[PDB]
Subunit: 236 residues, 4 copies
């Protein structure tokens, strides 16, 4: 069993597993059942942006997701990840489709991580930025149906001639582990941005996209398809 | 009226103006009377580090100040900084001494500010670092007794041959105004770190150091010395 | 007499003053007469990008400017900017029209300056990016006709409801003085990027755009319209 | 085989394989026989700093090695790495001892890489900073004798108590491969800084420290000890 922290952009209401009866963004600690959600209106066919934030002093994980036009939803949860996440983790993006389907396309992705103690110049930091993904992205660990198309976009779930398929899971985790805690740590922070394209010719769509933090050796759990977004073995 | 947000490292208790009866770090919104404080213990002669954070989605301002070897104090405040600051500001450091005194030596200072819209790109961002201040720093607005020394440190309050002077007040602000929000913006964030050296051969010390965010045209208010940290005209 | 280093995007060949007989990019030390040029082909109405690069060890200053679809020109000069620039400077963008005219539109601009010593942690960094300029850009010193427009673009040169005007000059300098050199400095570096739109309804266009490093108090010299790119007084 | 590009801090003159007859820094392209060298004076027991630099427009790889109090040596070489290196690479630090020995201690290491196309915000970027190394650094591929001591330092070659061993080789690579070229790429640059401690009780020391760039799967080649710095299998 992995340890998962996630921000979900949930495109299909699964009210049998605790979803609100609407599309939503959620903060997940160790369970598909979000600790907090906010109503979110998916603009089918438009490029969205999501910004995710945490600081071990504030101890508040927050996310905002908006579309051009200025529709934006936000969600926050007070939590001390310090004592949830292992001291080394990997960061990633995952998506799923089930019976209903959508493209789950990542157009760009940024991440910044900091570990500090007794100075400006802090014991550790990582920063990566993709404003396009290459044909063989060697710094991404691709899981399930995740791959990159020739426009330089990362399709987390299967697409056939631009057209999305049923029951697909995919994940991309950055190759290098991220040092999120130490015994001598004073502050830890991370920031993530990604842009995304949820599209379908149909109007009922599923299942969503998540940004997640996990133990370094995390892999798609068995039976994590559709509503579990490739993150959880069961409907926790 | 200036318009001040500040994190104070308050080395001298003034219980007639709301201080706890002990040394503290605090968070000041428009008043020397802190909206929150935490007990903190100055380690005379030692180099300390302060990390200040804020993100407009979490709306939680927070500070932590550590000394090497594991002692540290943290304080945070829930505040929507949009309610309070102008949308352009200047950021700086200030310190004071009264009857009692201490060096207020800044040894390094970093600041990062981001605006955000709909990309991994930043509608705007600024980042500066100083790990040593030059003898004539044209990018700092020096106010009052603030001056840099021949080690390459910033001595906010007067110093002669090592020994601190009484009744000194001094501030340093970064030359460039920072754009801390636009209504046409999705998220705004800043992060500040500084390392400092508070020292006396005396037994009582005063009055402290602050990181502060003020309107662009801010200057030391009349009678803002001593307990007012060179930030406020009165004790309101 | 201003001290000037510039990278020019020369859109009009003024051969009487040593331009080569075609549109070009140049490296200007202290004079409108570039110490090196390379053929450059302006694509009227397209968004181009320039990247400028310098490192005090390598002592080569270079620039490349490209349009989408693989069209790009590069110029380099071996030079020791130590012995040319003052310790403190300002950085900016300037543009001009003469009889012949063009839009000198800037869409985004970033700069990074580093001074290093004997650390992973630089003695001094500035880094700014603009991906859109606000309508009162309090952190840019605008000179001459330079202003920002309602789409959040910086128009260095006069535009009258869509259409560019003749005999216009305009510069935009970053408010904060940049510390490009110090004597305890082991390395100094900088990089700049800007994207630009050069558009025109006429066949013959002028005069160009330049990025430039100048003494802190630099202003538009007198009679520096047109071929002199708002940069020099004479043509020597 | 491995395709190596390296900057060597060569502490022992092996003149019978091209080394000059003094301690030196050198630029290595695919051979231990440096394409360029400069005389460099090792300071036994002192912390030194290397700054390494490259930019695909300038096509100049340069390194500077300095010690406090004004002792710098610089080397550089005109090369177009574009056509030398693979599209993906790993980056690392290597060192060795032979009969004569030294500590090869890395106190800090940072690295920055960029792939630009046409925006201010580029296609691909990586940056990591270590100002101390963890007890198990999960983001570093440790090879041969490389390991981390309890002071947060990285020991490339074997050291028993405070004492250097004989015939040691060890390397550290960053976990994530680096994207140093793409077909849509317009500019590619990198920058590396590390601080080191070469020390020995005895006067004559060996063999030295390298910053190197290799194909992703690179490991210590057979028989690459001592004078080959754990970089090349032979002295060609
Ligand atoms: Ca769902
Ligand atoms: Ca007080
Ligand atoms: Ca011209
Ligand atoms: Ca040798
Ligand atoms: Mn949900
Ligand atoms: Mn107080
Ligand atoms: Mn010219
Ligand atoms: Mn050699």
């Amino acid at each position: 069993a992995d340890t998962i922290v996630a921000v979900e952009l949930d495109t299909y209401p699964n009210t049998d597993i605790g979803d609100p009866n609407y599309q939503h963004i959620g903060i997940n600690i160790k369970s598909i059942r979000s600790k907090a959600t906010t109503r979110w209106n998916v603009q089918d066919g438009k490029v969205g942006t999501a910004h995710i934030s945490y600081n071990s002093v504030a101890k508040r994980l927050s996310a905002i997701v908006s579309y051009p036009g200025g529709s934006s939803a936000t969600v926050s949860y007070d939590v001390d990840l310090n004592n949830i996440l292992p001291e080394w983790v990997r960061v990633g993006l995952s998506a799923s489709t089930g019976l209903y389907k959508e493209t789950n396309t990542i157009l760009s992705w940024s991440f910044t991580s900091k570990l500090k103690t007794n100075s400006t110049a802090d014991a550790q930091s990582l920063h990566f930025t993709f404003n396009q993904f290459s044909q063989n992205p060697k710094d991404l660990i691709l899981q399930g149906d995740a791959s990159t198309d020739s426009d330089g976009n990362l399709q987390l779930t299967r697409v056939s001639n631009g057209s999305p398929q049923s029951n697909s899971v995919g994940r991309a985790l950055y190759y290098a582990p991220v040092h999120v805690w130490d015994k001598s740590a004073v502050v830890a922070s991370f920031d993530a941005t990604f842009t995304f394209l949820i599209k379908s010719t149909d109007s009922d769509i599923a299942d969503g996209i998540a940004f997640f933090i996990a133990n370094t050796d995390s892999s798609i759990p068995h039976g994590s398809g559709g509503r579990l977004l490739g993150l959880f073995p069961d409907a926790n």
